[PDB]
């Protein structure tokens, strides 16, 4: 009877331009894919079509590329205006800059509203942030109204950088409240949009009361009803249909990431805000679809800005650089090693190395004449840490390696890219004992070899400040450290690399394996 | 009733001055070994108590380091003038600059008689090269004569540079009527001196009739009875006995190489020349042994020639370059994955390389203070070739690859090291088919990894000239190669790339192993 055609992106992480077919800097125009100026001609084309629209974004806009790494986030909020976004829901990268990183860019000057829940801030915070996000926020919608209700990974304190002054809620005990307080107020229509994974949306809609709907991102899923038009490989049907406590049938959705595809959602209502039905699939933004001028033109006044980091040839490549998740979560891929290999030359003393998969964000492409610039290694770590020394056990690695394949199969970051190690596994096993070989680089020894690793012996190892820290669930690492030492920016680290070699060409070459039985 | 003392020497190869243990450059003066000063003063020790000696150099003084590149052989015509040998025999490397390169520099300089018996010039060159070198040599050994008859390797044209001109006879086809000849003028003690190898020099002391001892070089050879006094292993007892077809006892001798050892021999006559018995082993030239100060203090006035070499330092190493033929010849040697990387990175297109152990004839020390100099380079590569591109088929380098290990266990420099291939040999399996597994880097990629190497397809490869031309029986490369190119100088490719790495750490990674079953 009343038709919400629902639109919706996460996981943008600052891929304002079109991009490659993998997400990287876009070379070939022609077939290119993606970009807010295309997201923009669909999005009309649609509000065109359909009277009842909204436009959402579940999280992570910030952090990605070098625009911001350069407008901090004023990007964000000037393109995200620009294509007039109805809502958003706060990710985990919105803290990547502090509170103020995310107050002043982008919570002041956003002319829509910025939602989550269960963020409570507390202390003297409480007072200036009051009202710059919302917990919900009851959008009109032609002549009916639509409430939407925000959430964030409970895990952003360990993923990013928010501070001591806001206290993280459980997903579900801060929604159901809000959702109860909306329901009082007769808004029966009501979508949950998030930013805490496909498993943590699947809950919302299962145990919170009421919701019609949940958006979300944060697991980069891509869902899809039928045969998909790219490489992603969906994880389930689009949308995922989730049948509640109360037996609701509740639809879940997720638009994959980097803006290459933009989800889409028909939801059938009736008079009492009940959801009859529902139907969609989310929308590749190829080069079919064509960029909108208007939103270009502004896209190229911003560039200019970011070319002197275009400019600069650091080095060339003869290989593709598979910086990739679907390879560096899951295999050796070949942009861990290249990274592993200048960790290793840049303090040579040290000749082991241990690489986080989730650290590694972006390929870079050999097709371009193999230039590679600054910008290019700016979409790989745009982290901007530091890869520090630690004193490591036998035993503390090998815990490590074991934490690496814990939980193989789920495009996870705590897999492990390394250097000077030899490791092979055998998924048969179970989880805590999966690691069946681990040859180390030899210190103690006039010609370096692969030796057995020692549980008892002590290791030197380069690996990022974010491993040395605790983070990915690598809590051996912090406590049973024997010494840390910080090291050079990573950025700088492999761009120095880069530019001593010249000409690199890094492979797939063993030091990660799989066996049979 | 008359004893004779044989000293003697073979494959020194430019070790003029003092080495390391392991035949280098000598950097810690407390612990070294060998060279001329150290050589002088044993043999005059020995001048002072045996009546009857001989001193004598069984071939190869030429090529070896940086003293030949420069002196070219007018350094070992001055210093084994002032040790005063009694006579020596051409190797194959006194023709490696040609058949000039051994008549200006070493045989109108020097005060001795260079023999070699199965040696016959032919054409143009034969008038000029008569009487330089002989075929014997009736010496007077106090109130005896003592006939010597030389012979060089019959493989020297392949091996090196000696020209059309100069034909290399069947050792025992040209020996045996210099011998019958010494034996009608009354010559009844005689002495085998020549550079065919170990089992040349057993065959030598069983087929010729009249030969009474066997001096020889080419195979470095160690022999020893006893327990040995340094790291190397005696291949058989000193002197090894040969039983002759006509019931002799005849003792064949070598010393090892680099003159890190005088051989010694003393062989018991009674009046008609026949060997009654005879007793020695090789003496261990170390620092117990002083250098001559007059001796050592002519080596100083040369060495300031050579010291322009020794300045400038290339790069840095912290780890021991295993350029020994003890591993580069029956192992994966980080020298030769060094060499490999040096030259797949000069050209970089092509990403396999195949490096025969052979060339590799020096390590290199990371005990003073990690420096590399072109004088540590020139003994490593003191050929001076080209590493040249090739293109080859898969069946011709599973041909090689077999090849590579078809006797394996001789010292033969003939064992590949290698680059972008992973190589697997099971040496219980007979020759011909001991290569079990052959993974090599892909070209046609994007990706590069290890995959099988197949039989028809077509592979880029680069590697010595030597090995191009067909050198140590590679006789399929250079007669099923599809393409050929000269590439750059040898040196000055490793040269090059340590300078652009600054500091190495080149290690032993699993390229070449080898099954149990
Ligand atoms: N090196 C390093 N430094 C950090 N500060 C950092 N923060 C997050 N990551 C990685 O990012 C991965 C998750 O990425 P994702 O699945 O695409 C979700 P999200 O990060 O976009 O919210 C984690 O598994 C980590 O490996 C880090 N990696
Ligand atoms: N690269 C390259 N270029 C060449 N021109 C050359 N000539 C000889 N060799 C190597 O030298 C090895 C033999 O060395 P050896 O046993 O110590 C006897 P000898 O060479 O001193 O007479 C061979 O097996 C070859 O690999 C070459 N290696
Ligand atoms: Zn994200
Ligand atoms: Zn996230
Ligand atoms: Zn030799
Ligand atoms: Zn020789």
Same mark, same amino acid.
């Not at 669930?473 to 920016?489: A, V």
């Given at each position: 009877?009343?038709?919400?055609?629902?639109?919706?992106?996460?996981?943008?992480?600052?891929?304002?331009?079109?991009?490659?077919?993998?997400?990287?800097?876009?070379?070939?125009?022609?077939?290119?894919?993606?970009?807010?100026?295309?997201?923009?001609?669909?999005?009309?084309?649609?509000?065109?079509?359909?009277?009842?629209?909204?436009?959402?974004?579940?999280?992570?806009?910030?952090?990605?590329?070098?625009?911001?790494?350069?407008?901090?986030g004023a990007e964000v909020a000037h393109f995200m205006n620009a294509l007039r976004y109805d809502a958003m829901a706060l990710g985990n990268h919105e803290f990547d800059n502090g509170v103020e990183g995310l107050i002043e860019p982008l919570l002041k000057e956003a002319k829509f509203p910025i939602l989550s829940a269960n963020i409570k801030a507390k202390g003297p915070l409480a007072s200036q942030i009051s009202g710059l996000y919302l917990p919900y926020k009851v959008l009109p919608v032609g002549d009916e109204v639509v409430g939407i209700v925000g959430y964030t990974s409970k895990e952003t304190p360990f993923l990013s950088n928010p501070g001591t002054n806001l206290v993280f809620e459980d997903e579900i005990t801060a929604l159901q409240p809000e959702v109860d307080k909306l329901k009082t107020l007769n808004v029966n229509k009501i979508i949950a949009l998030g930013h805490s994974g496909f498993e943590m949306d699947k809950l919302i809609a299962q145990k919170v009361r009421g919701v019609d709907v949940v958006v979300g991102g944060h697991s980069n899923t891509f869902l899809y009803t039928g045969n998909p038009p790219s490489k992603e490989v969906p994880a389930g049907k689009y949308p995922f249909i989730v049948t509640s406590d109360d037996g609701r049938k509740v639809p879940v959705v997720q638009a994959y990431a980097f803006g290459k595809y933009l989800g889409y959602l028909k939801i059938e209502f009736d008079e009492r805000g009940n959801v009859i039905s529902s139907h969609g699939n989310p929308i590749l933004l190829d080069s079919s679809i064509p960029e909108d001028p208007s939103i270009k033109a502004d896209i190229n006044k911003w560039r200019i800005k970011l070319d002197d980091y275009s400019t600069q040839e650091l080095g060339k490549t003869i290989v593709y650089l598979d910086g990739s998740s679907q390879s560096c979560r899951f295999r050796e891929c070949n942009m861990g090693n290249l990274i592993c290999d200048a960790m290793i030359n840049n303090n040579l003393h040290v000749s082991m190395c241990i690489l986080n998969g989730g650290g590694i964000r972006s390929p870079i492409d050999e097709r371009n004449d193999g230039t590679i610039t600054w910008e290019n290694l700016a979409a790989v770590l745009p982290f901007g840490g530091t890869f520090d020394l630690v004193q490591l056990k036998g035993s503390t690695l090998k815990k490590?390696?074991?934490?690496?394949?814990?939980?193989?199969?789920?495009?996870?970051?705590?897999?492990?890219?390394?250097?000077?190690?030899?490791?092979?596994?055998?998924?048969?096993?179970?989880?805590? &004992?999966?690691?069946?070989?681990? =040859?180390?680089?030899?210190?103690?020894?006039? $010609?370096? @070899?692969?030796?057995?690793? +020692? *549980?008892?012996?002590?290791?030197?190892?380069?690996?990022?400040?974010?491993?040395?820290?605790?983070?990915?669930?690598?809590?051996?690492?912090? &406590?049973?450290?024997?010494?840390? =030492?910080?090291?050079?920016?990573?950025?700088? $680290?492999? @761009?120095?690399?880069?530019? +001593? *070699?010249?000409?690199?060409?890094?492979?797939?070459?063993?030091?990660?394996?799989?066996?049979?039985?």
């Open positions: 009877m009343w038709e919400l055609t629902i639109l919706h992106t996460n996981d943008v992480h600052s891929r304002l331009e079109q991009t490659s077919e993998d997400s990287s800097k876009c070379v070939d125009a022609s077939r290119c894919m993606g970009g807010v100026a295309r997201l923009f001609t669909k999005v009309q084309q649609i509000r065109r079509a359909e009277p009842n629209v909204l436009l959402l974004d579940a999280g992570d806009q910030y952090q990605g590329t070098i625009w911001f790494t350069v407008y901090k490590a390696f074991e934490h690496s394949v814990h939980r193989y199969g789920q495009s996870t970051g705590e897999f492990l890219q390394v250097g000077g190690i030899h490791v092979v596994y055998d998924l048969s096993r179970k989880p805590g &004992d999966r690691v069946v070989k681990l =040859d180390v680089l030899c210190t103690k020894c006039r $010609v370096p @070899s692969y030796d057995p690793l +020692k *549980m008892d012996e002590v290791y030197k190892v380069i690996l990022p400040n974010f491993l040395a820290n605790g983070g990915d669930g690598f809590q051996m690492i912090k &406590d049973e450290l024997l010494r840390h =030492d910080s090291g050079d920016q990573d950025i700088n $680290v492999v @761009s120095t690399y880069i530019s +001593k *070699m010249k000409v690199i060409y890094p492979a797939v070459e063993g030091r990660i394996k799989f066996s049979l039985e």
